[PDB]
UniProtKB/Swiss-Prot annotation:
The keyword Nucleotide-binding applies. Disulfide bonds: none annotated. A motif ('HIGH' region) lies at residues 42-52. Keywords: Aminoacyl-tRNA synthetase, ATP-binding, Cytoplasm, Ligase, Nucleotide-binding, Protein biosynthesis. It is an enzyme of class 6 (ligase). This is Leucine--tRNA ligase. Belongs to the class-I aminoacyl-tRNA synthetase family. PROSITE patterns: AA_TRNA_LIGASE_I. ATP binds at residue 637. GO terms for cellular component: cytosol. It comes from Neisseria gonorrhoeae (strain NCCP11945). InterPro entries: aa-tRNA-synth_I_CS (IPR001412), aa-tRNA-synth_Ia (IPR002300), Leu-tRNA-ligase (IPR002302), Leu_tRNA-synth_edit (IPR025709), M/V/L/I-tRNA-synth_anticd-bd (IPR013155), Methionyl/Leucyl_tRNA_Synth (IPR015413), Rossmann-like_a/b/a_fold (IPR014729), tRNAsynth_Ia_anticodon-bd (IPR009080).
């Protein structure tokens, strides 16, 4: 064994050893229990950084732990390859998105290889390859013919200068981002997944997910946004019917989740596009102006909660069906057309939005709910005004005295008796719009025929292949300018026809890749029956909270769709979910002569601080002129504060990088990049290396201690106690708690105790061998390179065949104590008690002592003094 730790040498050799043994290349082996650990696959946008590495190290720790415990572990890696990153690169570097993507995949894969993750590279997928996306095209056509995918007009942001559709994140103050031109709302046919048909399933199946973080489930529940409410119809008054046609001339229908407050409605509000708004604004220019203002606004919820709620009266009136009140209709900017009926009732006394609205326009506020003996001031909103739980109804006729649910059911029965309303369930969830007017994405497998309509491409003709020899420019999608792509024949009639030129939302690739990994070369379906049956669901998913809503909802949705197609037989894709904390790092920039600022990478700057740490120098390593030190932010390409792992690996090795990530913080907690934390990890790896070297120097390897430890010295018994307490702790930290930083600390404490133990004797060396053989296996999931090498210097068996260390329970028992039993302070007996014996057990054992019971003369104990470890005194 070489004396000094040299990661640059031992890490490649360890990786070759694992690759040659194929320990991470797994089959559907029925002779071993399966375990599917999955980390969210990256966008191949250039270079991974230490944030990504933290994510993938967490998964590797979990995977290697399960591997050592004899699981057949699949840990797959892949590339989420479609999307806007490559198209922007195409407009910048004038290169094809495909070529840019594949160049990035090559570099990033070597980044991953250098870190030594136990990945099945034979299951690698790249979602931009036809062999992959043909199957989401396949599922698209199957669902299209069922109506689960459908085509309908939707609204988009049209830029009249750049000649392209814009995402809602690229429209600033109603104008384009790179143009400043006023954005037009344009209706165009697009494709949708009818996810609303699965809303109840997607909502209720969350309860099955007992090993998901509650906040993730809460966020998905709020996104789906189920409510149990009441449809309520207010008959239009006779004086207010002019210009109204059909049902809108007879009644105004609204949806409310508080039908228990219907006796407290004081006004009603409709959306600008509502037929009552249009009819009232026919002769009223002020209402036309207000309507036009509404339609020229962002219905996005982001701007709506921050929106100043405005309204105008209409002079039209409706009748509350329960108390006969005549209520005025208002047009209001917060009422959204397309959500429910586009019309709401207002109860200012018990809804905060209605309270502030009525405080602006001085509209009536009528209390219909009392919550105990609390004071109701019509001029002050209080948090209990809208309490659904502990409130009771007032001013409500025969509803007086009922709670929320009883009043809800009563109002339901009354309204249905009058034909004026009925219970109704609604959802905030909208259908999932798939169409993107972009090039670098999965083509939509639809053919447009002027005789046959929108026709799905037959499965034999799938994939519709995206041409890769394309350099987008931004002036619209190039597919729509490529007749060699879009000119085709109709698959139903054979006539001339045109391919759909929109591509799919790239969330589609990530909604099923976890199944594709189970059989990534299967050419007869999305996933082979046998591999799906073997792997079941993902046992462990690890990824950032930014994908907790959309990605996870879409993946659960696709899972149910594929199940209903008979492709898989699970209801949920991910059993356990781990949301790793963000790696954050200080940022640096320089003011650009073009106005803005240019962000510099931390590895290209030099910072010299004072003796008190006072930042006094911060120069760029390319000129030596200063640079601006800025705030500490999430590690990302955005502010160019991404630390390249290859830089860290060249300086310190993969194991140092992995150890720093796993030790610096609990995995869910944010992790600040630290040069000192890196140095601290490296020093521990040298310590570990030195420990094994100095151990083998003084005599070489022996058989590890095992079996009966009677006759072992007290110091060695204590070391074995620390050893097996550590094995128990680390096993729980990896398996149950998933807290890796404390597992490493536990192993460090064991080595601290080892360091203070004389292990030179024959028995001492056997215990030393046991401790070191355990320590290197306990740490192997974190730092497998150094642990693999150190293990082979200690022992000749394969580390993965020796398996995870076992807890020797006999090593955990401490010696028994002899306690003196006194009666009135006079020594009358002795008891032998456990070292863990409580004071109640000492009392119980002393009362039952032979010499104690005789010298107690049948008299009871007035007091029992218990000195643990010394005496019990019965008086
Ligand atoms: C399933 C798909 C929708 C996933 C999609 N392709 C994606 O998110 O790909 P992306 O390449 O963006 O990230 C890959 C993983 O790395 C994490 N991550 C990134 N930056 C950091 C950081 N500073 N600190 C900690 N973790 C970080 C991020 O949360 C994610 O789990
Ligand atoms: N088109 C609409 N635009 C704006 N608000 C509406 C619309 N339709 C209904 N509302 C109002 O939203 C209220 C409840 O909102 P929603 O349907 O989102 O349920 P919720 O927020 O879960 O319910 P709660 O307010 O009890 O928490 C209803 O009482 C109604 O007054
Ligand atoms: Mg269960
Ligand atoms: Zn046709």
């Amino acid at each position: 064994m070489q004396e000094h730790y040299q990661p640059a040498a031992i890490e490649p050799a360890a990786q070759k050893k694992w690759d040659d043994a194929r320990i991470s290349n797994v089959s559907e082996d029925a002779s071993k229990p399966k375990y599917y650990c999955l980390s969210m696959f990256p966008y191949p946008s250039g270079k991974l950084h230490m944030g990504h590495v933290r994510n993938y190290t967490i998964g590797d720790v979990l995977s290697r732990f399960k591997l050592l415990n004899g699981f057949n572990v699949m840990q797959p890696m892949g590339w989420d390859a479609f999307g806007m990153p490559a198209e922007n690169a195409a407009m910048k570097n004038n290169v094809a998105p495909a070529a840019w993507t594949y160049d990035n995949i090559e570099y990033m894969k070597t980044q991953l290889k250098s870190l030594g993750f136990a990945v099945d590279w034979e299951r690698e997928v790249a979602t931009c390859k036809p062999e992959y996306y043909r199957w989401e095209q396949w599922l698209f056509t199957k669902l299209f013919e069922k109506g689960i995918v459908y085509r309908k007009n939707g609204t988009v942001n049209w830029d009249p200068v750049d000649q392209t559709v814009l995402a809602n994140g690229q429209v600033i103050d109603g104008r384009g981002w790179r143009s400043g031109a006023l954005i037009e709302k344009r209706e165009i046919p697009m494709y949708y997944f009818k996810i609303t048909d699965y809303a109840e399933e997607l909502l209720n199946d969350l309860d099955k997910l007992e090993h998901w973080p509650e906040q993730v489930k809460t966020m998905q529940r709020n996104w789906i946004g189920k409510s149990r409410g009441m449809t309520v119809r207010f008959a239009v008054s006779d004086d207010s019917k002019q210009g109204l046609e059909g049902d809108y001339a007879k009644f105004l229908q609204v949806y409310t989740t508080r039908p228990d407050t219907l006796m407290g409605a004081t006004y009603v509000a409709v959306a600008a596009e509502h037929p009552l708004a249009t009819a009232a604004a026919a002769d009223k220019p002020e209402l036309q102006a207000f309507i036009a203002e509404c339609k020229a606004g962002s219905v996005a919820e982001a701007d709506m909660a921050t929106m100043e709620k405005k309204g105008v009266p209409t002079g039209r009136y409706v009748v509350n069906p329960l108390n006969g009140d005549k209520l005025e209709v208002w047009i209001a900017n917060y009422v959204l057309w397309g959500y429910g009926d586009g019309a709401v009732m207002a109860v200012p006394a018990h809804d905060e939005r209605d309270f502030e609205f009525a405080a602006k326009y001085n509209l009536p506020k009528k209390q219909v709910i009392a919550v105990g003996d609390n004071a109701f001031d019509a001029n002050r909103w209080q948090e209990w005004y809208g309490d659904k739980e502990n409130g009771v109804l007032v001013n409500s006729g025969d509803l007086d005295g009922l709670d929320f649910q009883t009043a809800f059911d009563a109002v339901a029965a009354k309204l249905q008796s009058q034909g004026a309303g009925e219970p109704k369930t609604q959802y905030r969830l909208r259908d999932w719009g798939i169409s993107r007017q972009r090039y670098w994405g999965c083509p939509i497998p639809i053919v447009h025929c002027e005789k046959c309509g929108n026709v799905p491409v037959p499965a034999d003709q799938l994939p519709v292949v995206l041409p890769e020899n394309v350099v987008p420019d931004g002036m619209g999608s190039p597919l729509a300018k490529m007749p060699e792509f879009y000119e085709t024949s109709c698959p139903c009639c054979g006539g001339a026809a045109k391919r759909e030129t929109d591509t799919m939302d790239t969330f589609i690739e990530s909604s099923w890749y976890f199944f594709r990994y189970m059989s990534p070369k299967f050419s007869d379906g999305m996933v082979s029956a046998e591999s799906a049956k073997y792997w079941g669901a993902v046992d462990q998913y690890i990824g950032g909270i930014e994908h907790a809503i959309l990605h996870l909802l879409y993946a659960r949705f696709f899972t149910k769709l594929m199940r209903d197609e008979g492709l898989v037989n699970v209801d949920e894709p991910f059993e356990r979910l781990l949301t790793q904390g963000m790696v954050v790092c200080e940022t640096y920039y320089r003011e650009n002569d073009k106005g803005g600022k240019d962000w510099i990478n931390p590895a290209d700057v030099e910072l010299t601080f004072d003796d008190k740490g006072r930042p006094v120098s911060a120069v760029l390593k390319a000129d030596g002129l200063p640079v601006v030190i800025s705030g500490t932010e999430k590690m990302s390409k955005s502010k160019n504060n991404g630390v390249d792992p290859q830089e860290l690996i060249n300086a310190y090795g993969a194991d140092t990088a992995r150890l720093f990530m796993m030790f610096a913080a609990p995995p869910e907690q944010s992790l600040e990049w630290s040069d000192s934390g890196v140095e601290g990890a490296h020093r521990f790896l040298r310590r570990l290396w030195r420990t094994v070297y100095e151990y083998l120097k003084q005599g070489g390897a022996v058989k590890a201690f095992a079996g009966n430890q009677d006759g072992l010295s007290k110091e060695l018994k204590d070391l074995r106690h620390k050893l097996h307490s550590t094995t128990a702790k680390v096993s729980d930290d990896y398996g149950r708690r998933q807290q890796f930083n404390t597992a490493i600390a536990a192993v460090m404490e064991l080595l601290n105790q080892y360091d203070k133990t004389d292990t030179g004797s024959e028995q001492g060396r056997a215990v030393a061998q046991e401790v070191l053989e355990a320590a290197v296996r306990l740490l192997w999931p974190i730092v497998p390179h150094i642990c693999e090498t150190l293990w082979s210097e200690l022992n000749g068996a394969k580390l993965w065949e020796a398996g995870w260390p076992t807890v020797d329970e006999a090593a955990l028992v401490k010696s028994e104590i002899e306690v003196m039993v006194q009666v009135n302070g006079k020594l009358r007996g002795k008891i032998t008690v456990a070292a863990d014996a409580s004071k109640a057990d000492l009392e119980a054992a002393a009362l039952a002592n032979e010499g104690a019971v005789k010298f107690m003369e049948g008299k009871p104990a007035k007091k029992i003094i218990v000195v643990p470890g010394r005496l019990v005194n019965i008086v």
